[PDB]
Amino acid sequence: NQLQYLHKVVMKALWKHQFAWPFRQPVDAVKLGLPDYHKIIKQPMDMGTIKRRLENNYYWAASECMQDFNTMFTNCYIYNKPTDDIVLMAQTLEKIFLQKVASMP
Amino acid sequence: NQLQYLHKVVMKALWKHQFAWPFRQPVDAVKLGLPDYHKIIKQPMDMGTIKRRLENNYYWAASECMQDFNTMFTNCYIYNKPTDDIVLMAQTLEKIFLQKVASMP
Ligand SMILES: Cc1nnc2n1-c1ccccc1C(c1ccccc1)=N[C@H]2NC(=O)OCc1ccccc1
Ligand SMILES: Cc1nnc2n1-c1ccccc1C(c1ccccc1)=N[C@H]2NC(=O)OCc1ccccc1
């Protein structure tokens, strides 16, 4: 019921979102040219991974899925500079995530 | 019911927590010697403010209170360096926040 909601309502909205594109797949540190990314960020996470996990019944509790969303956003804030656009993008998506989590069954 | 839960269960646990102390009052940029804090962080938030707001029935929806917790943690990640202790402290508290939010009525 709760994981159904996270998949059917929360992920549906965030995946579609205008600012979703950077978070749809794992950060490729080599392509992006970020040699220090995996030195700073120890637990990478992204929406593609969360989506697969929801589809394949990976999670046992809603909170596990919620923690993955949180880790995704947090990594972005920790690695990037405050003035970066990605930071505003993460904030916008996280706000919507928390709003819908408040309405979870 | 939901705001009661946020006050009685969520705030109760986080306020007591070992790592709560830096977040119990607004960041005093002058005392802490952070001249650029309010240039970078545009919406300051802290647990003291959230606690007063819960006590005084300030909030209309649980999500408003949840957004304040999120803003508090996010500010910490954006302003501080990745290796700072406060960053680990925020992560620990945020994990507990999200865990209890998953059990909200
Ligand atoms: C997700 C995520 N998390 N971080 C990043 N993405 C990301 C993932 C996939 C694609 C893009 C991005 C964007 C991005 C997103 C949107 C707009 C602009 C940028 N930015 C990436 N970070 C970056 O390029 O760091 C700059 C840097 C480089 C070297 C050293 C220090 C700092
Ligand atoms: C909350 C919160 N958010 N940021 C900070 N606190 C905070 C609030 C109240 C009290 C302490 C702290 C601690 C803290 C907390 C715990 C342990 C260590 C530190 N650190 C503060 N930041 C800081 O000193 O920046 C270093 C800096 C200075 C100048 C320039 C650049 C960077």
Curated annotation (Swiss-Prot), chains A, B:
Changing residue 37 to A: Abolished binding to histone H4 acetylated at 'Lys-12' (H4K12ac). Residues 1-104 form the Bromo domain. Changing residue 2 to A: Loss of homodimerization. Transmembrane segments: none annotated. A protein binds at residues 36, 79-81, 84-85. It is found in: Nucleus; Chromosome. Homodimer. Interacts with E2F1. Interacts with (acetylated) STAT3; promoting STAT3 recruitment to chromatin. Interacts with CTCF; promoting BRD2 recruitment to chromatin. Chromatin reader protein that specifically recognizes and binds histone H4 acetylated at 'Lys-5' and 'Lys-12' (H4K5ac and H4K12ac, respectively), thereby controlling gene expression and remodeling chromatin structures. Recruits transcription factors and coactivators to target gene sites, and activates RNA polymerase II machinery for transcriptional elongation. The first bromo domain specifically recognizes histone H4 acetylated at 'Lys-12' (H4K12ac). It also specifically binds histone H4 acetyl-methylated at 'Lys-5' and 'Lys-12' (H4K5acme and H4K12acme, respectively). The second bromo domain recognizes and binds histone H4 acetylated at 'Lys-5' and 'Lys-12' (H4K5ac and H4K12ac, respectively). Some specific inhibitors of BRD2 that prevent binding to acetylated histone are promising therapeutic molecules for the treatment of cancers or inflammatory diseases. ABBV-744, a small molecule, has been tested on tumors with success: ABBV-744 antiproliferative activity is mainly restricted to cell lines of acute myeloid leukaemia and prostate cancer and is able to displace BRD4 from chromatin. GSK046 (iBET-BD2), which specifically inhibits the second bromo domain, is a promising therapeutic small molecule for the treatment of inflammatory and autoimmune diseases. Belongs to the BET family. This is Bromodomain-containing protein 2. It comes from Homo sapiens (Human). The chain holds residues 77 to 181 of 801 of the full protein.
